[PDB]
A paper describes a structure:
The AP–[name] repair complex is primarily composed of a Ku homodimer, DNA ligase (Lig), DNA polymerase (Pol) and a phosphoesterase (PE). Studies on [name] repair in Mtu and the archaeon [name] (Mpa) demonstrated that both species possess equivalent core AP–[name] components, with orthologous proteins possessing near identical substrate specificities. We discovered that Pol has DNA strand displacement activity during RNA synthesis and that PE resects excessive incorporation to promote efficient break ligation. In this current study, we sought to extend our understanding of AP–[name] by comparing crystal structures of the archaeal (Mpa) Pol and PE with those of the established bacterial (M. tuberculosis and P. aeruginosa) DSB repair complexes.
We purified Mpa Pol and crystallized the enzyme, as described in the methods. The structure of Mpa Pol was elucidated at 1.95 Å resolution and a ribbon representation of its structural features is shown in Figure 3A. Mpa Pol shares close structural homology with the bacterial [name] polymerases from M. tuberculosis and P. aeruginosa. Based on the close structural similarities between all these polymerases, we can infer that the key structural elements such as Loop 1, Loop 2, the 5′-phosphate binding pocket and the active site perform similar functions in the DSB repair process. Having shown that Mpa Pol is a bona fide member of the AP–[name] family, we next superposed the structure onto that of Mtu PolDom in complex with an incoming nucleotide and DNA. We found that the nucleotide and DNA substrate of the Mtu PolDom structures overlaid precisely with the Mpa Pol structure. The Mpa and Mtu Pols do not have strictly conserved primary amino acid sequences, yet both Loop 1 and Loop 2 adopt similar formations, suggesting a conserved function. We previously reported that Mpa Pol, in common with other [name] polymerases, is preferentially a DNA-dependent RNA polymerase with an innate capacity to perform strand displacement synthesis. Examination of the crystal structures of Pol reveals that these enzymes contain a prominent surface protrusion that plays a critical role in this displacement activity. We identify that a conserved arginine residue in this structure acts as a molecular wedge against the annealed interface of the downstream DNA and is critical for enabling displacement synthesis during polymerase extension that occurs during AP–[name] repair. The structural architecture of the archaeal [name] Pol reported here shows that it is highly similar to the bacterial [name] polymerases, supporting conservation in the functional mechanisms of these enzymes in DSB repair.
Author numbering: 13 to 313
Write the structure that this text describes.
């Protein structure tokens, strides 16, 4: 279950002053691809320059696969006791009662260390820990009911035009699976309840305009094949796949920020993957480089 590549039993990377040990780097995590633990860590190391700004401050849930994606992996919200103290934790009060300590990935060392701990996919809050109930992202999470990319691509364009028509900045990323997130950056002046009411009301208006096409029906059977305008990530405690996060799918696809024009150049949500994304970055640059400069507020409050 190796692709031997000359690695030592343990490689030590030196990132931002921290020694990060990568044990068994030639262990295969993607069996159809021969993508090893080391190659995954190297992906997160080179992508860190663009990804760190997009995940810093966010409570992060880890989807870890110590034996690769062909075997069972797990979600983990409570930070491991053995993570070094320089890996930031956020202290969160559970609605249950009591507290949870989640990782916050505030720098490249942390990102690389989490990859070395077999994190494949990071999932992050729509808010940052210094104002954890006040999102800086509004997400519409679009998946096609027919598993056809054109279905989600056309919905994403219409939704973008509807938000652009109201005066909002609209950003976009693939999820590296089947879907797209349409994203409005926010200035953190409204709390989640306000943002989510907006998102639901917007979805409701869009549904009334295109009633055979879109739905906000919460029950899957009532949808009757219409695309769900999923506003439900806009709550405290919800996560979305991190921008530049790897999915646990063959080919190692990446949830990639893309421009609206680029949406027509691609063929599907898994267009970019750890092995072809560097060519993309070289040619196109980070589509979300200025996302936070466009941070805005909900109109008519
Ligand atoms: Na939100």
């Amino acid at each position: 279950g190796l692709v031997p590549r000359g690695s030592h039993m343990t490689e030590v990377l030196h990132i931002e002053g921290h020694d990060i040990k990568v044990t068994n780097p030639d262990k295969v995590l993607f069996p159809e691809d021969g993508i090893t633990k080391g190659e995954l860590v190297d992906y997160y190391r080179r992508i860190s320059g663009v990804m760190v700004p997009l995940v810093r401050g966010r409570p992060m849930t880890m989807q870890r696969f110590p034996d690769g994606i062909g075997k069972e992996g797990f979600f983990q919200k409570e930070a491991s006791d053995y993570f070094p103290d320089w890996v930031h934790r956020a202290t969160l009060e559970l609605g249950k009662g009591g507290i949870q300590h989640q990782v916050v990935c505030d720098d490249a060392a942390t990102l690389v260390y989490l990859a070395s701990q077999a994190m494949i996919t990071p999932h992050v809050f729509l808010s940052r820990i210094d104002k954890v109930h006040y999102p800086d992202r509004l997400i519409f999470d679009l998946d096609p009911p027919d598993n056809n990319f054109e279905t989600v691509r056309s919905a994403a364009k219409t939704i973008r035009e509807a938000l652009d028509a109201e005066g909002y900045p609209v950003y976009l990323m693939t999820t590296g699976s089947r879907g797209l997130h349409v994203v409005v950056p926010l200035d953190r002046s409204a709390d989640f309840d306000t943002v989510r009411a907006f998102a639901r009301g917007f979805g409701e208006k869009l549904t009334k305009k295109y009633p055979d096409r879109f739905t906000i029906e919460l029950s899957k059977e009532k949808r009757r094949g219409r695309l769900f305008l999923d506003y439900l990530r806009n709550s405290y405690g919800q996560t979305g796949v991190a921008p530049y996060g790897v999915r646990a799918r063959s080919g190692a696809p990446v949830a990639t920020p893309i421009t609206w024009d680029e949406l027509d150049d691609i063929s599907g949500s898994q267009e970019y993957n750890i092995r072809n994304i560097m060519g993309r970055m070289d040619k196109r640059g980070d589509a979300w480089k200025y996302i936070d400069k466009d941070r805005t507020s909900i109109k008519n409050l």
